[PDB]
């Protein structure tokens, strides 16, 4: 009358037969999330195989299937990305809540389907009154994570979230979408952070708001760090790492929250050292040195190595317009420290590529006795997507982690470095940026 594994075998035999249509797949997936069956990977594989095999599709079964895929936290890019054709065929016959669920669902998996996001953003900005603001935040999440830099829907969401007072989780999802988009509209972000006072039913959305405000660098809200402090048990290590990183980037001062987060994070690396990817380990080292909070002795040297690994791996896969910009800034450092001709320009630039204490390699490393000045070029991938174009919080993270190694990191962003006439003004700008960081040079 209440039995979990026998109903798992009933769903298992219901999905293993040959002619399963889509409604049986959808409710098998929903019934597989509601029983929380992350322990069985083969059953989710059978359900996703039958979801890829189905050809009939209406609004309801597609919507509940996509809801179940994202609530259960399963990821298979093939069967989810092949569910977007059923979406674009059924898109005008979708309800606004159904379009919300499918666009958030296909955006969360990262489906690069530009026709779906264009024809969904056109729908949600053609009839904006139809959409309750949670539907707005879900479509914003999906269009942001699907790889379109859509600011039309971002401006429409800013108007809705400034006009309509919204939920805590709704505002958190909108903050996560705006953080991936890199937009930092204070008129929108303020209207979202004012919604974090009614008490939050989840901890993952407070952690996502902390990571979002860290990525945008507004400041720590103090109505988010306390909710994250009390409820640091609802987070995976890969989630508490993002939480602590976004707390340290926004400039939080509470150490009790960092104790509560690293008490989750550090025994996960004690049990399994390799289970967390090196982007999370680098974010952990950032959060461990910026706020100064302490974590065990193996984990400290581990993330100290892993920040260097992730740093020179991101250097190795450099975007090739960041690389020419780093060459331009290094030539400007050459003719700013005094190098009249091109042989000593090239000799200075090749001299500036000294290594790092963590094993990495730094592009423009100028040392004078004990005082060292590192120069950073922040091209456009680490800028805000607006016409002010303030650099994102990750370059402040990199600067503040290199600063604990002995450097006085000078930031040379490319929105203004490229707006200079020639090499003399660029050398003047680089020297002025160095002097207001370290005037001892």
């Amino acid at each position: 009358e209440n039995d979990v594994p026998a109903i798992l075998k009933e769903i298992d035999s219901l999905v293993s037969r040959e002619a399963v249509s889509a409604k049986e797949v959808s409710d098998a997936a929903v019934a597989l999330t509601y029983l929380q069956v992350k322990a069985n990977r083969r059953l989710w594989g059978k359900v996703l195989e039958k979801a890829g095999a189905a050809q009939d599709y209406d609004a309801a079964s597609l919507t509940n299937l996509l809801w179940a895929i994202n609530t259960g936290g399963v990821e298979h890019f093939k069967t989810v990305a092949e569910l977007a054709g059923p979406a674009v065929s059924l898109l005008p016959s979708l309800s606004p809540v159904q379009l919300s669920i499918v666009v958030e669902a296909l955006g969360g998996a990262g489906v690069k389907n530009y026709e779906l996001y264009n024809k969904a953003s056109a729908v949600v900005v053609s009839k904006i009154g139809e959409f309750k603001p949670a539907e707005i935040a879900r479509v914003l999440y999906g269009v942001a994570f699907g790889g379109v830099n859509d600011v039309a829907l971002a401006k429409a969401a800013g108007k809705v979230f400034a006009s309509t007072e919204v939920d805590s989780r709704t505002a958190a999802q909108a903050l996560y979408a705006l953080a991936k988009l890199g937009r930092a509209d204070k008129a929108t972000v303020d209207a979202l952070l004012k919604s974090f006072k009614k008490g939050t039913e989840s901890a993952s959305d407070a952690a996502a708001a902390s990571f979002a405000l860290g990525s945008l660098s507004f400041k720590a809200e103090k109505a988010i760090v306390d909710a994250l402090k009390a409820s640091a048990g609802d987070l995976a290590p890969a989630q508490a790492v993002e939480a602590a990183y976004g707390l340290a980037l926004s400039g939080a001062t509470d150490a009790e929250a960092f104790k509560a987060l690293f008490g989750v994070v550090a025994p996960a690396i004690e049990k399994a050292p390799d289970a967390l990817e090196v982007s999370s380990l680098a974010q952990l080292h950032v959060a461990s040195t910026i706020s100064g909070a302490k974590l065990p002795a193996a984990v400290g040297s581990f993330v100290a190595k892993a920040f260097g690994l992730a740093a020179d791996a991101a250097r190795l896969k450099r975007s090739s317009a960041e690389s020419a910009l780093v060459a331009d800034v290094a030539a400007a450092t050459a003719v700013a420290f005094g190098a009249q001709y091109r042989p000593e320009v090239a000799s200075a630039v090749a001299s500036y590529v000294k290594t790092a204490p963590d094993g990495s390699v730094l592009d423009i490393a100028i040392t004078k006795g004990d005082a060292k000045v590192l120069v950073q070029a922040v091209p456009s991938s680490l800028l805000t997507s607006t016409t002010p174009a303030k650099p994102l919080g990750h370059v402040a993270a990199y600067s503040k982690v290199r600063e604990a190694q002995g450097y006085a990191v000078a930031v040379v962003p490319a929105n203004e470095f490229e707006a200079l006439p020639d090499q003399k003004a660029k050398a003047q700008y680089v020297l002025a940026a160095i002097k207001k960081v370290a005037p001892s040079f």
Binding site: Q340, Y341, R342, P343, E344
Partner: protein, 76 residues
Amino acid sequence: CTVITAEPLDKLERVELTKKAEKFVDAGFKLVMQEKIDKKLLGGFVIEFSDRRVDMSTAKKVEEFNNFVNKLVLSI
């Protein structure tokens, strides 16, 4: 002599190019130059001794590099 450079020279490019070029005259030989410009050289230089040519340009270096690596991967 005659030197062809990609862009017009600096006065240290001229001096160390002059010091580079005395390895191709094996005596106490002075060089006068007739410096020309060819943008299809991508840096480096081409020395023309009117009986002898030294190609220290980098267009020659990248095409010889490409010949080397396109030959060596056929060897393995």
